[PDB]
């Protein structure tokens, strides 16, 4: 329950439970989407090591729990919102100076992507810092993610 693979499965199970409208969503779907982005950034030379680690998955889950609406209407919409949260996670917590947009963009309307980034930042900026500053809060989030399975 400490391995990346297990926590990622917890996140996938959480999203399936959260997004009750998505009847054909698999808990492995979010895992595939996240791993795919991380592999692509590695292979393409944007990073030397993977971003997806236990701590970063906890960070990502903290964003998802507050940002992803139970009312998401399609698997596509879930992917777009999840990937927006992922992009903000790389941006905030990643070891590289910057990351490209391409792997995170699955929508035709780029302006919606940028508006979503700003909305998430307005909602989450305090908690993004607090999860780093407060080990008790990080522990709470980690425990919550574990209990998602």
């Amino acid at each position: 329950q400490a391995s990346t693979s297990e926590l990622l499965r917890c996140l996938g199970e959480f999203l399936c439970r959260r997004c009750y409208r998505l009847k054909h969503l698999s808990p492995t779907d979010p895992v595939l989407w996240l791993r795919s982005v991380d592999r692509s950034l590695l292979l393409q030379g944007w990073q030397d090591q993977g971003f997806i680690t236990p701590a970063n998955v906890v960070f990502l889950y903290m964003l998802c729990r507050d940002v992803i609406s139970s009312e998401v209407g399609s698997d596509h919409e879930l992917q777009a919102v999840l990937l927006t949260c992922l992009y903000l996670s790389y941006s905030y917590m990643g070891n590289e100076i910057s990351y490209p947009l391409k792997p995170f963009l699955v929508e035709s309307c780029k302006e919606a992507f940028w508006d979503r980034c700003l909305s998430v930042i307005n909602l989450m900026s305090s908690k993004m810092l607090q999860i780093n500053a407060d080990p008790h809060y990080f522990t709470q989030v980690f425990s919550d993610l574990k209990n998602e399975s």
Binding site: Y90, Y92, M93, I97, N132
Partner: protein, 289 residues
Amino acid sequence: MQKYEKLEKIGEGTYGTVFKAKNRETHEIVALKRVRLDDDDEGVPSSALREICLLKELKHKNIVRLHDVLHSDKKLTLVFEFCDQDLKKYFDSCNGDLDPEIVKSFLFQLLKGLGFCHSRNVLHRDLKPQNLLINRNGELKLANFGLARAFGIPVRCYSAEVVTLWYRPPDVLFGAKLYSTSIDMWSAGCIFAELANAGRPLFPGNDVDDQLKRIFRLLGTPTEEQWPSMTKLPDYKPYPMYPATTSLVNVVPKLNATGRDLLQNLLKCNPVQRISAEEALQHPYFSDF
């Protein structure tokens, strides 16, 4: 933007382009940092988003103030307080020759801003004169947080490719993958030396090797007893043992023994031994201030 009238392009954005502007509604002068979102330089918005996230949580008189963020066109605009110049330009303006009271004021304000960042669990990681803004009121602000990061969550490593070379501490030059608030404290010591002499970098190394040599040549090479983990660092290699006996008196002529003592507490090679911003503000250098 419609609310803002552009006045001049005044800014080496760290990742974008800075303009002086006027708020048409309030007539206030601000700085706008504009970022193209329909990029050809793929990763820029990522750094900007990180800076926005951090600056929203860092409201202090000695940290550049982000007032607003606008999204229009295919552009992200950060609205910042306007500052007349940076420390690098200020040095050019005064022939590198600051009054010792202004040296003290500038260091004090830097440390207050930096202390605030560190207390909020944020590392700046690019502390250098061009990233320090100065007002005509004499107010100094830490700026350009595009290399900054929150710290505290369990991480395998950070990047050792942080801090402009001349301002980078020896543990990081030796490839340390974990560092704390101490990273910025070294850079503050470097800036302090420029303030207290003639506004020129103390350690202008040509590459990492030259950088370490210049540092040790002045301060002395650390021994195993002063810095036991030094030889275990990932990019450690043997350096000559330069003596710890070289006087700094002529390196920082604007400083008394008190100031030289603070300088040496900032410029400790072993990061564990480096003074914190909070401790520095309580140093007797600032007592009659």
